[PDB]
Symmetry: D2
Subunit: 386 residues, 4 copies
């Protein structure tokens, strides 16, 4: 289970670079030079890295300081063959963003947030990013009166519309991905789930430019089924990027390494991504626990890719197993894929076998055979044949 | 706080009529005649009632039996002045629907579900309903392999598209509302939240015919902020109906009377509905606890309306209080409602005060004053002036 | 992975016998004769069965009817070699228990609940049960004022104390196990977690007679770590029985087959039970989903035992792997097992290396190496060596 | 609703002093001098303040630096009349505690944690504290293999036993309170709920010295009913201290001001505390949101006390209302307080009215009248009479 760049595994600089500061504790690890993280991740078999503007260029940096940081980073990318498929803006760390960026109540902050974002869009394009992610981690509220959500959604639309006008006017070949999170650090965050993000995108001026960047742990913080949500995003044609990690249920955002947390959900996710032929980066937005020294950082990062590759193998074996294919037919997964009424409405209405002569009791008595199928899935996941 | 039909309070027959059967217990109350519930609810000041087909017409009923049940019901509506603003289909109780209705794996069940739905759409129109609700309570799965969600969403779209073709071809003045629920009775239900439902509607052939029917407790079963979700639905122009009740957090669907559960959320919901001028029914989808006899049923139903009316008064006092209006300005709610960059993209880009000369530290130092505002909201809710 | 009676796998009659009635749906399966379930479970390799009084003897049965049901059941146990290690009382289904049994507000109901319980204790002893479980599923409240919890806990203590006086006076060799559940069917249930149950037991007159019967899914309905809670119960010497099933997070009680739900938690549970040498029944309190016909019932029941046995093998391989044993030392699990200050308080106080000369920065810099250990655990679970 | 020191409202230095650093953001407020917080809180009507050792004495401080910080603090207490009823140790911020203090795998860290705790116990006694709180925020794990919970509980017992031996040998009049939290910052924290803490205390050598310090938001992070848990703690005689704040459901620890979050739960809590005559400090462990400047800090702190006092008034009016007293009788709260079988076991067994002649159907038909009672409680909370 050795990854290669062909597997398109990507990591954020802020992931392996997380110093271990949490709400109750100081950093347990020194800062990592981005150049060092690029080199170490390349050695592990990663395909590329991603960055917030402020991960790469310290906030407040001069234009010449900015130039030197980018040059050194480019050199490490050239030395390693690592790509930068995705970039994003930090609109959450600095105190100015304490009430949000795009939907801050203060208008001057919203304009600043846009300008900070645009500056980094230009850098992302220069470094070759195809996807620009927006995680509005400070967009939201702790109290009901602080935020009129209709006005906030107007401001969010306005912001994304202006970004879309910017990238179009510049001729940039880059698309946007909205990353939902239900809460944390705000008490409730706007666009809290994949569904809310999808719905919002349809009200943008140029919806084709926007997709979602769902995160495993974020949807699971609302107790939702992450493979189900990814399926809906794929059905909508909007899965532009994906953030992979682990989460043990409804609690603070743990950002465990992928495969940790809900393992069965990870299996079904990989099954879906591979079956749908998702072609984008497999990006890990995770935090090596602050219990770990640097050797644990790289072990946790390695484990992300390892677990993906193990699950890929098991999901492929599951789908290729003739006993499973027969079980899917026994559970009528084939019938689910056929149209209900390709004969059309009038034919349905005139079809007495669909109502007047439908034997509901005989249909009710048919077992779905789902537990046999699910145990075959369990056996395959655990490598107990099937 | 006495309700009148002018308040547009509506109840489902299945609410006051719930016999108290839960997963671990038999009925504690005898069945209510729908005619009796209409009369009792009218006496309480309700505006109208809603029904599943199977609440009103026992499943398996003859066409003549069906006729007599409808005639008796119409008579009680004529005697009381009660309206029927909304109707829905029971696609969840009968065993034939154990794997769903519209997205059952068995194709013959899906066709039956459509025909059962269409039959009731005709009845709803005859009784004057404006909104036809669809709660796909059995659409979903307990296991990953049982349901290919992309195919299920194709089948769900197909079903709703066919219903839209039916109502258009019949010339019916009725709109559809999708009611999301994250789980229960299925392990995960498709279209689990308002956001997912909104996103799905945009992929229907005639999206204008479809809105959402969010339920307080359902969104709170995913830990989401119900007023936030309603705000998004209103912003999208899709709040066609609303189900009001109470829920104590992430657990089984409690269907407590409205005002119970998260009281502050109820306050902010009423504030929003009244401020947005929501004109639709205030419908209670609640269950009088099975601890109650019939006197408790009517007391709980009365309490639904009472709590709405109390919260309406408090929310109105909050918004009318000059000290609150000043506090909203102090927190820059006025600024949130102004466009970020009505001057347009190029002006924003050339505006040095938006980036190069923006004093981020002075903006960061500005307090939002949200806690003062929220305590004014608390004081108003509790009737401690403000 | 074929179970034998030596594995001590037990099932409740109500598990495979669940007819599929849920809050929103009728039964999908006919009733199973208890004699038939005993025979089918024996064929699957189960060790024994458990029962509520009302599973075995229909409520309201005559003494002669009661006699005939018990005789037929005994015959099937004699024919199959199946044991009855545990029995319990149904104090939740009948409407009389709608506000509880032992803590019902009505005193006459509480006395009835005790007498119904005692009658079944005598039957349990006659059938050879060693453990008598009490799941107070109706003990609790939906509203704050309905239940004074201090008085309810007095009534709960009184009930359990009287049962303990009964079994002592009769000379019965039977112990009690309290089964916690946080909610459902009551809005909040008293003694909601293993911890609450443990704490309560210490206030009983004869605490030695009482332990806990934790259920996987119940603790996970509060988002708690089930292996952690079992560890505390084992540390207290109070793990008298255990209910095994699966649960996908904080939602309604799903009672999925064991191994479903949180698979990693299942692995760590088995690891703990086997490492601690838990000798009691491995009892499955699960529901075959109502999507299943009888073949699915037996497949789901079989899967319970299969998954236990697979996880047992993986957990044993994990613990036996020299690379894992070295990793445990690297993470200082050995040091966790040594006393902190066996030298005693005064020696600790005088030990300058414990404070005045303790190099906190060098200790802070030591990595815990937990992520490497956890990936070895993952590799073992998935059968990817280690 | 003006508080006076007679109301025994206390605040942690770390509450109003929280600088606003969260997992995703820098501080938004400068550090507060503890002397300044004491003065400002006294002006607001607080009774006293509490502290972690490291809030008051910067970590690493010299003995003379330590002396000067304590002297300045004492002076502000003497100037203001403020008391210090409670103190605690910071065993969570410094990296050395990244795997815990009392249950760190490294033995030298556990000995250091004890010595750091003992040093502060001496200071707490000198400043007049009656309660010494222990919040083991780093005691726990993110992964199953990192922490053998039986050994960790041995180490936790050993630690608390040694502290109890220390305070006894010194003759200190101080008691210990364990503060449970289910998770955050560890993935799962040991002793996650009030129940677990209560159960653990009973295994200590001197259980009389230990109680619980439950926090509103912590129990609600497991979805539990906080008044229920407080009731159990009171029933056990173990409510030594209480931390008051607000929490919006199962998510990260929000530490909202008291009254925010679940308002009905706050009402029932106050009702219980006042009805039980809880005499201890009403301590607020809350964080003014990082959106606030210092004026918002004091407004949020003021709101804590205000909301307690409003709820106290409403709960008192509820209990004093003759209509409520009649409703409690109608719901048989009086009967709940009478013994079930003061006549004893043999009398119960011979009482045919308790089983053979008990009319279960007539008892089943009795309504509990809980919804009427709960609406009276709602009316009182909202000041709509009753
Ligand atoms: Mg995350
Ligand atoms: Mg992410
Ligand atoms: Mg509901
Ligand atoms: Mg509803
Ligand atoms: Mg269960
Ligand atoms: Mg159980
Ligand atoms: Mg807290
Ligand atoms: Mg606290």
């Amino acid at each position: 289970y050795q990854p290669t760049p062909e597997d398109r595994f990507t990591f954020g600089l802020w992931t392996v670079g997380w110093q271990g500061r949490d709400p109750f504790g100081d950093a347990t690890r020194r800062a990592l030079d981005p150049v060092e993280s690029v080199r170490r991740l390349a050695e592990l078999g990663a395909h590329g890295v991603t960055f917030h503007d402020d991960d790469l260029i310290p906030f407040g940096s001069s234009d010449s300081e900015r130039e030197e940081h980018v040059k050194r980073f480019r050199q490490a990318l050239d030395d390693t063959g690592m790509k930068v498929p995705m970039a994003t803006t930090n609109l959450f760390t600095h105190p100015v963003f304490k009430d949000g960026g795009f939907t801050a109540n203060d208008r001057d902050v919203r304009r600043y947030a846009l300008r900070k974002t645009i500056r980094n869009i230009d850098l992302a394009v220069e470094l070759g990013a195809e996807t620009y992610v927006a995680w509005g981690g400070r967009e939201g509220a702790e109290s009901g009166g602080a935020k009129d959500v209709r006005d906030a959604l107007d401001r969010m639309k306005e912001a994304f519309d202006l970004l879309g006008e910017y990238v179009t006017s510049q001729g940039y070949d880059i698309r946007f991905a909205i990353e939902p999170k239900p809460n944390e650090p705000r008490g409730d965050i706007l666009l809290p789930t994949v569904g809310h993000a999808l719905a919002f995108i349809e009200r943008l001026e140029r919806p084709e430019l926007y997709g979602v960047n769902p995160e495993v742990g974020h949807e699971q913080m609302a107790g939702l089924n992450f493979p189900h949500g990814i399926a809906q995003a794929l059905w909508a044609g909007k899965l532009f990027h994906i953030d992979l990690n682990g989460q043990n249920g409804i609690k603070y955002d743990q950002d465990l390494r992928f495969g940790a947390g809900d393992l069965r959900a990870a299996f079904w996710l990989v099954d879906l991504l591979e079956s749908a032929g998702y072609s984008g980066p497999r990006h890990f937005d995770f935090k090596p626990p602050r219990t770990e020294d640097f050797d644990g950082v790289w072990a946790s990062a390695a484990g992300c890719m390892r677990n993906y590759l193990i699950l890929k193998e098991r999901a492929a074996a599951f789908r290729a197993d003739p006993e499973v294919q027969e079980a899917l037919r026994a559970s009528r997964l084939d019938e689910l894929a056929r149209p209900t009424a390709a004969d059309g409405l009038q034919a349905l209405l005139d079809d007495r076998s669909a109502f007047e002569e439908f034997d509901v009791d005989a249909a009710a008595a048919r077992g779905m055979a789902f537990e046999r199928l699910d145990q075959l899935a369990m056996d395959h996941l655990l490598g107990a044949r099937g």
